[model samples]
Target: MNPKRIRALKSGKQGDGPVVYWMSRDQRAEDNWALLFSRAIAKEANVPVVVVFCLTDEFLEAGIRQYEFMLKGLQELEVSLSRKKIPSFFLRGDPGEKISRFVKDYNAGTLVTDFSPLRIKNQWIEKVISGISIPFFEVDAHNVVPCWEASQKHEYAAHTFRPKLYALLPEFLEEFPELEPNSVTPEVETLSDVLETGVKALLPERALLKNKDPLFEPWHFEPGEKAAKKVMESFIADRLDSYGALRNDPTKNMLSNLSPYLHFGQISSQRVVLEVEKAESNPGSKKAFLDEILIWKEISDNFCYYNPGYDGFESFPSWAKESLNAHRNDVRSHIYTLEEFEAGKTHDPLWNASQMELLSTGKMHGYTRMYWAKKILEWSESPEKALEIAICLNDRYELDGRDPNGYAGIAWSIGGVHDRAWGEREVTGKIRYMSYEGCKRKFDVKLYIEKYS
Candidate 1:
């Protein structure tokens, strides 16, 4: 692994114990620079290496559904790491305290972790840095081009961010090196025992909808790196050719459906990019896919990393904030409460179907998601309320919710974060507007509605 990907979070000497990889965002055992970096440091120091996952039950708006998906992936990851003689522990409760205490308790020599730009993860990182006395480092394993390496500031849009990102891709988008097995062993309880003993406590107060049909079906996404790799391969083989032409059409099913994996860091975007680049697909389609994973993904991280108010209405650009504030009091044709929206009880069949798709399957087609969020803005009482409802519903339901892409996309839909202002209008003001007619023209909206219904 290139040393460029690793950034020291604190100045401290490496202690005299195991090298700990605090596996947080990037859950996979393979193709992870953070884990690889941990191994390298451990090898150099001739100390044992271990992985720790602090399972915080109260992670933003994440619910039991999100926990289940993540925990299952971690289970497989624990097994994968164990095969290489790397012991991993799943500690429940506060991440920062748990991870800090775990490192100190084991007298860890060094600490390395994967990067996430989300506020909660940043908070956890800060807390860990404050608590740990050993050398700590963070590796950008999530992005093909590391977030900090991409841009120093929050980019305005894809146009401004694309050239900069593409220019540096050659340097940063190289293939991941193989992770060698650890020569040193650690004495720790298996993650399975930790999970089995504390698994019940891990469940939230409410964990309904576990047996929901659409979410668990084999045709839809299954959690873990193995499943993620399959999805990426199938997308390259089947959908890459027509991605450019049909990605915007909700009914086409031409989208990659890799957002959940990408959001959870189950698979490396660089790995996906390499495969897509090598595929004998349409150049336009390949570029389109690459743009989504590379330019857009990095842009989202850049937004969150630099913008502290990323999840709030204030995160919108100045023009967006001005336009929205000017039109905040505009009379709405309809209004819906959180419950109404969550139950998919809107008058518009299309929006309701989109919500149902998300509720049933823990996902919404990306194209429809735009319309879904916009309608939330139109029907809610205020811009703040609209953003709140959109984010609340998004985080509470969608599998890929509480992600940077979701935040950036919602902001774009409701507050023109990365989008140019459209023709001035009521309620939405200058924000880009999406109408039922527009969606109808784009795809078979009726078919989508009927299927979800």
Candidate 2:
């Protein structure tokens, strides 16, 4: 990391006040640059480092499922941070307002936080930056290569961004620095009492409780640092070797189901990359894991950056836009409303099962996802409605909902974002399509449907 760039932000006046590590994107203790950086700042300034996580109810497209998963992870984080003597505080409200109020209360001179490319997170950061006079530093802990440094303009495709990411990986993928606790443990106001006294009635019901127990529940992922490490370790130990071949199989547990952790910043991509590098004895295994973390994630970020409207209907490519618009009024043999799909009552048992799996498990196989979205395109009244239904349902249900990958994946299956045009098909036109037979051949569709249905 460039010390000059890191130190360019304004520092607090020399004092014994706490240095705030606002936990947002990168929510992990090990292999976290932002937390390590904050600790270093606190040590130099001779004050304790405090971590704050804000739990707000107003995030767009996020419901109880996302919150429940996050809260579970955060519960694990609180316990871990306690061991480090770094007080981790949770405040319930709009994050921007909560951060500003907390910083002001502590008289914090400096604030260090993780990076997020999503518009809402950026908006919160902007609001907090405007409200605070202190020096606020944003660390790009999400990507192995910083998004801005990787490409100034939105990349046209993965091929365009892959080489750039490879070139910069060495510089940024260095081992994580060891973090030492701050010398001074400053007395801070307790927010726990305030949170308890606040309106408990307004709290959204926990989503995880409504369904089958998650793969792990002790780690209520509510935006803390420790849960991230545990998820990463599980992935490295159990799943990375088979990632290349099994990632697309819906019926198997071959792929590392770490997106929920990654999406919530419970773990950094660099940490995953480093761990995969260490664990995979074979070059192919390392290549496979890195491809998903660095290559695929970079492509998602690139697509979102260049196409700011990537989430909206307007972001579809010219070819897709024209094709979909041509078939806008085309009649459909079957059209299911969003509610029907949400209830997993579609005519296609495979699609319904996939939807149910995502709804219940907070995850689905990558291959299943492609088939799931393409089927939406085929069944909806028009390509546009198909895109809307797929995106909306995925965003609303998945544990890692409303993410760049979800948007990009939906667009790619429906309108060809990072993909080439396919041979024309009935509702799909030239858009790529995956079939049930294709899925059946690759995995046990009968088993999947039986399990999820």
Candidate 3:
């Protein structure tokens, strides 16, 4: 990890106690720049290096399904750290309040945290910055190219941002150095403070087996760094060669199923890039795969960081909002309730299949999601409501929901985000139009619908 990856946020005075890396967005210790950076400081200062992870009982739209993934992943993470002679602490309340007290008493030399563009995460960081007297650093461990490094402002479109990212890739895209095992012990009683006296009591393995959901039939998407690498290997070996040809086809299993891991920070995008770039694959296929992981994924992060109303209807491009309003009163062909959509009761079989796929498998293919958003715009009372419905369904059911990528993606499908006005049509106007016929020309619609519905 480069020094540019770590941004010092507050006063630069360092204390003589142990160094604490507050694990946030980037969870895995392996290939994590934040943790790696913390270790370097600890090594240089000759202070013990320890770790802390803060959690809440509830996160936005997060349930047993999401929590189980996170806690279990953390469990696996703690085990890995233990073997390295590094102790991990778990704090369960407000990060600012809990972490501030922990750091002050523990005598932390410097504080290191990770990046997150979400409003709540930013607010927590702000509170944390104010409460701590020690020097605090924030690391962009999430992005392959740091979000700020990629672009400083909101990009008009992918085309506008692609050059900027590619220009910096040679500098930022490199193999991550391993977090070397450290046996040096810290004076602070880390594990004991975390387990009984710190924040909340946790028994992660038991917690993983307790969640039950009828709305979302849980699929076998394992959580943890070890499992994540295995999935990435499978995608590169079996799917990358076919990605360019079949990624858009929902029926084919060629899309890299790494979004959930990426969203949770269970796997590093940098590792994915390094591995895929070295894989034996077609040039076009390699480029396509990299584009998704590097450019396309980073664009969504840039959007959330730059645009405050990223998930709001107001965040739509001016032309998109105006265009949708122009066609708002165009008569709907078929209107369905939120329940109808959740139950996959839409008159269109393809749309229903798309919904069912998300509900059952915890994810939907990218292409079908575009079609799904367009059809919702076509059938709902208005384009505005269509955007609402699309976000609700995806967030509630998909494994990668409540993320910037999903938000921007839904906006593009429903509101022409990073997209221009199309030839005007009824109910859609300048917004892009997708139809059952359009899907029929793309792939075998029956196979997709039958498999899901």
Q: Output the number of the lDDT-best candidate.
A: 1
Candidate 1 per-residue lDDT, tens place, 1-453, comes to 677888989979789998998888888988888888888999999888898888675643465567667767888887888899998887877877888888888999998888888888888887888898888899998887888888889889889999999999889888878888888676744545655544455454333343543332323678899999999998998988999999988777888888888878899888898888888979999888888988887888888889999888888999889988898888999999998898788999999999878876788898989899999999989888988899898988878888888888888889898789789998889999888998888888888998887
lDDT of 2 by residue, 100-137 (tens): 89988888868888766677777787788767777778
Return the TM-score for each candidate structure. Answer: 0.94, 0.87, 0.91
Clashing pairs in 1: none
Each prediction's whole-model lDDT (CA): 0.84, 0.72, 0.81
Q: Which 10 consecutive residues of model 3 have the lowest summed lDDT?
A: 201-210
Model 1 clash tally, residue pairs: 0
Candidate 2 TM-score, C-alpha based: 0.87
- State, as a TM-score between 0 and 1, how close model 3 is to the true structure: 0.91
At residue 166, what lDDT does model 3 achieve? 93
Q: Write the per-residue lDDT of candidate 3 for residues 1-453, one digit (tens) a residue.
A: 577777878976799988899988888978899989988888888887899988753453444556656667888898999888888888777888988988898999999988888887888888888888899988999887888878889886888989999999899988878787675756523433433422232222111211443454555688889999999999998999989899889999898889889988999999999998789998888988888888778898898899998877788899888888887888888888887876778778898889878766787888998888888878899766887888887776677777778888887888888888889888888988887898899899999989975
RMSD of each: 2.4, 3.8, 4.1
